[PDB]
Amino acid sequence: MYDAIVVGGGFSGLKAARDLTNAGKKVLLLEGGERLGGRAYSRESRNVPGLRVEIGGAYLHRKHHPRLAAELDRYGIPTAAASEFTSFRHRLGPTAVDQAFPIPGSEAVAVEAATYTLLRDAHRIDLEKGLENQDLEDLDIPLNEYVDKLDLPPVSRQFLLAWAWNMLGQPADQASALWMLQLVAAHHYSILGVVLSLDEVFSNGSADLVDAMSQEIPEIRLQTVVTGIDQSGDVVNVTVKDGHAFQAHSVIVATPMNTWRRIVFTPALPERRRSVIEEGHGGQGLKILIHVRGAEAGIECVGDGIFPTLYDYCEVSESERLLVAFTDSGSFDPTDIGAVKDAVLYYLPEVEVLGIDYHDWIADPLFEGPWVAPRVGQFSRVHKELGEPAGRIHFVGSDVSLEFPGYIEGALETAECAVNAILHS
Amino acid sequence: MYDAIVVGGGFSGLKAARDLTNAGKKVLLLEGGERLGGRAYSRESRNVPGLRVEIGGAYLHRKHHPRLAAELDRYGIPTAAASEFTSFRHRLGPTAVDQAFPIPGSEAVAVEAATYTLLRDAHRIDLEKGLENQDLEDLDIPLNEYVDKLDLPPVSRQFLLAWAWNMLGQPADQASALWMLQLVAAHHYSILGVVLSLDEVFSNGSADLVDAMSQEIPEIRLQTVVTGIDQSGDVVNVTVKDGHAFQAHSVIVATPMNTWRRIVFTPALPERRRSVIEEGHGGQGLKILIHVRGAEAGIECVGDGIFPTLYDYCEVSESERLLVAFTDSGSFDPTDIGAVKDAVLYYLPEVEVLGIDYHDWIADPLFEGPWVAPRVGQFSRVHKELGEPAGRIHFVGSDVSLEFPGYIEGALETAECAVNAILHS
Ligand SMILES: Cc1cc2nc3c(=O)[nH]c(=O)nc-3n(C[C@H](O)[C@H](O)[C@H](O)COP(=O)(O)OP(=O)(O)OC[C@H]3O[C@@H](n4cnc5c(N)ncnc54)[C@H](O)[C@@H]3O)c2cc1C
Ligand SMILES: Cc1cc2nc3c(=O)[nH]c(=O)nc-3n(C[C@H](O)[C@H](O)[C@H](O)COP(=O)(O)OP(=O)(O)OC[C@H]3O[C@@H](n4cnc5c(N)ncnc54)[C@H](O)[C@@H]3O)c2cc1C
C-alpha cells in the first residue's frame, strides 16, 4: 500500500507521480492503456513509413508555457519551430489579403473596435477564481451569438470564427463565448496570442519528454484500468478491471474528464459536480494529418470551409507533404475520403490527397474526447470545483486547469497544485 | 442696433450669423481682417503661380463631420479624395514595413495591448461633460510620460508619437495625454480614425464654402477689429479699433481663443476662465507646403524626423510636386531653408526643395495660434466653461468644441449651440 496512487499516465499523472516520488513518497502509477503520454501521442505515420507524427497535442510556446519550458530544459529535450507559413491560400472573400493576418485596411476600424470589446470582456475573467464564481453568465452563450453582436465585416468575422473553430474544436453554435474569452485570458489577455502559441514542437516527438519523465517513476502498471475509487475506509481502495485492488492514503485522478463517469466513486462525488461529469464537456476537436501531392511548402489556409484551417505540417519529399486540418467530429467524418478531398480542394484545388491519419479521441474509451471545451452553460455553473479535491481524492489534468485548459501546460500546472496539496496535508 | 453681433468670420461666426439671420434676427458680422474664413484659408501658392492651396485647415471626413457634410451638400460644394499614399518612405527603423500601417508582426502583440489600454482610457471621456468635470486629472500629463508607460516597441512607439506630433501640433513633452485621448474619443473612440479623417478636401478650396455661407449674411464689416465688449448696460456695447461702436442684445465671440485676452470684457469674464485665457492654449502646429523636384507621386513619410510626417499634397508638373510637412513652431523654424532641406532629405534624400509656403498663425495678431491644443494641466482645470456664455456674451469656435476641437466640424457644432441658446432666450 502506497502514499499515493496516481490514475492516468498523461503529462499530469506523470508529473504528479514523479514529483511525489522525489519528495520521498511511495507512489504507484496506474495507466489503463499500453502507452504513456495520453493525449500527447507521437507515433509512426500511417501514411509515410518511418515518419514520426503527433496525433494528439504537441504545439507549445515557451513564453506561455513556463512549466513545459522547464521540463524541456530539465531533460535537454530539443524543440523546433513549427512549420513556417509563407504561402497564403485563404477562403475569406475577395477583399482578404493573402498574408497571415489577412485583414484589409477597409476593415481596420471594425477590428480596432472589436479588439477593445473582446479584450474588455476577457479582462472580466480572473483566472484564479473559476468561471462559475465571477458573475460571467451573460457571456456563457453560443459563440455565434456573441460574434453577431460584434458586427464584424466579412474577413475579420470569418477569420475569428475559423480560428475559434480550430481552437475550441466546436462549431460556432456550440462553442461558448465565455470559453473563447477564457482562452484569450489564458494567453495573457491576447487574441493574437491564442494562435501565436503555435510556436514550437518536439524535435523527436512528445514521447521524448514522456519517456524522460517516466524514467523517474519507479512503479508503473500499464493496461490497468481503474473502475472504482472508494474512500469510505481509513485508506483509499482502488479497484481495477481485471486485477487485484490497490490501496493508498491519497488518490490523484489524472484521467480525462469525460472518463470520470466510468469510475465508481465511494462515496459519490459532491453533488454540484455530478451533472457535468455525467454529461461530459463538449470538446469535439478533430486534427487530421493529410498526406498530399502537389502542395508547395509553407501553405496556410484559413476560411469558411468545413476545414476552418488547413496548413503545412511537414515535408515528406520533393513532391509530397503532410498538411494538417482542424475541424470537429460533429461536423466532419474523416472516414469519408471524398469529403476530405472536397474540403482540401476548396482551398487547394491543385492538390491531390494521398491519404489521411488521425486518432478518434472521442471513440477511445480511455478518453471519450479530445481537448476540453464546455458546452454552453456548463462552466458558469461549475468549473473550479471540478478540479478541487473530494476528501483524499484529487482531480488534475488539462481538462480542469483554470490557467491553461486544453493545453499540456494545464496538465503540468494542475499536477503542481495537487502535489503541493498532498505534501502539506 | 442689432439682435446679435457676431465677432469673427470664420466658419463658426459665419454659421452663427447666417443661421440667426435666417431665423429672422437682425445680425451684424464684424471681421477684423480683409477676408472671411479665418483658419480656413485657401489662396494662391507662393511657389506655383495659378495653383490654389490650403494654408490653414482643410481636410474633412463626411462621416466624422456631419455638420460640414451638410453644408457641402447644402451648397453643392464639390470635394475630392485627399492625395493617395502609394509609396512609403518611413523613418521608423529597419523592422518597419513600408506601408501605411508600418507595424511588423513582431510588434503585433504589443500593439494589441496598447490598443486596449488607449481605448479603455479614451472611454473614460464623456464628450458632453467637459474635461475638467470627470476626474481625468491623472491622464493630464505629458504625452511622453503616458507613452512611456505603454512600453511600446520601436516602430509602434514612434509611429504613434509621430502622428501625435502632427495632430496635436506639440512635441511629446508638451502635449497632454488627456488631449490625445480626447481626439481619440472625438473620432468615435478610434485611434485609427484620428488619421483616417484625412479623407477629403475642397475641390475648389475652402473659400468655396466660405463664400456660399457669406452670401447669406446681409451685413458684414471687414477690417473691423473688436477691442471691447461691455455688457454692463441693458444692451451690449461693442467697441472697435478705429470705429464707432456697435450695440446688440447678444454678442457671439467667434474669435480664436488665444485672442480673447486682447479684448476688454466688462464686466470681467468669470474668474475660473481668466488664467487659461491669459496664458492661451499651447497649440503650435505648423503646416508647411514644400515645393519639390524629383519626388514620385503618392509618397508618405512617417518617422522620427523633425518633420514627424511628410507626405504628398499635389501634382504640379511631371517633375514637380508639393509635399506637406507637419511639425511645430516651437521646434522648427521654417525661415531656415537649410533646416527644411535637411528635414526633407532625412526621409527623401533624392528630392530637391524648390521652395516653401506657410502661414505663421502664431504671429498673426488675428489668431495667435494654429488649432487648439492645451498645455498640460489646463483642460482638466477648465474646459467646458470656456465655451459657456457669460451673460449675453457667447463663446464659440473650434477651440472650444467639446465634440470636435481643432476641426472645422467643431466650429460648426459650437455655432449651432449658441444659435439655439439665443433663439430660446
Ligand atoms: C487532437 C489534439 C490536439 C491537441 N493540441 C495541443 C497542442 O497543440 N498543444 C497543447 O499544449 N495541447 C494540445 N492538446 C491538449 C493536450 O494534449 C491535453 O490536454 C493533455 O495532453 C492532457 O494531459 P492530461 O495529463 O490532462 O490527460 P491525458 O494525456 O488524457 O492522460 C489521461 C491518462 O488517463 C488514462 N486513463 C483513462 N481512463 C483510465 C482509467 N479508468 N484507468 C487508468 N488510466 C486511465 C489515459 O489512457 C491517459 O494515458 C491536444 C489534444 C488533442 C487530443
Ligand atoms: C495649420 C492648420 C491646419 C488645420 N487643419 C485642419 C484640418 O485638416 N481639418 C479641420 O477640420 N480643421 C483644420 N484646422 C483647424 C480649423 O481650421 C480651425 O479650428 C477652424 O477653421 C476655426 O474656425 P473658427 O470659426 O473657430 O475660428 P477662425 O477661423 O479662427 O475664425 C476666427 C475669426 O476671428 C477673426 N478675428 C480675430 N480677432 C478679432 C477681433 N478682435 N475682432 C474681429 N475679428 C477678429 C479672425 O480674423 C477670424 O476670421 C487647421 C487649422 C490650422 C491653423
From Swiss-Prot, chains A, B:
Binds 1 FAD per subunit. It is found in: Cytoplasm. Its EC number is 1.5.3.5. (S)-6-hydroxynicotine binds at residues 166, 311, 326, 371, 407. One of its GO terms (biological process) is nicotine catabolic process. Keywords: Alkaloid metabolism, Cytoplasm, FAD, Flavoprotein, Nucleotide-binding, Oxidoreductase, Plasmid. Inhibited by (R)-6-hydroxynicotine. Inhibited by high concentrations of phenanthroline. Activity is strongly affected by Hg(2+) and p-chloromercuriphenylsulfonate, but not by N-ethylmaleimide and 5,5'-dithiobis-(2-nitrobenzoate). Pathway: Alkaloid degradation; nicotine degradation; 6-hydroxypseudooxynicotine from nicotine (S-isomer route): step 2/2. GO terms for cellular component: cytoplasm. Changing residue 407 to F: No change in kcat with (S)-6-hydroxynicotine as substrate. Belongs to the flavin monoamine oxidase family. Consists of two domains, an FAD-binding domain and a substrate-binding domain. The inactive D-stereoisomer binds in mirror symmetry with respect to the catalytic axis, revealing absolute stereospecificity of hydrogen transfer to the flavin. This is (S)-6-hydroxynicotine oxidase. The gene is 6-hlno.
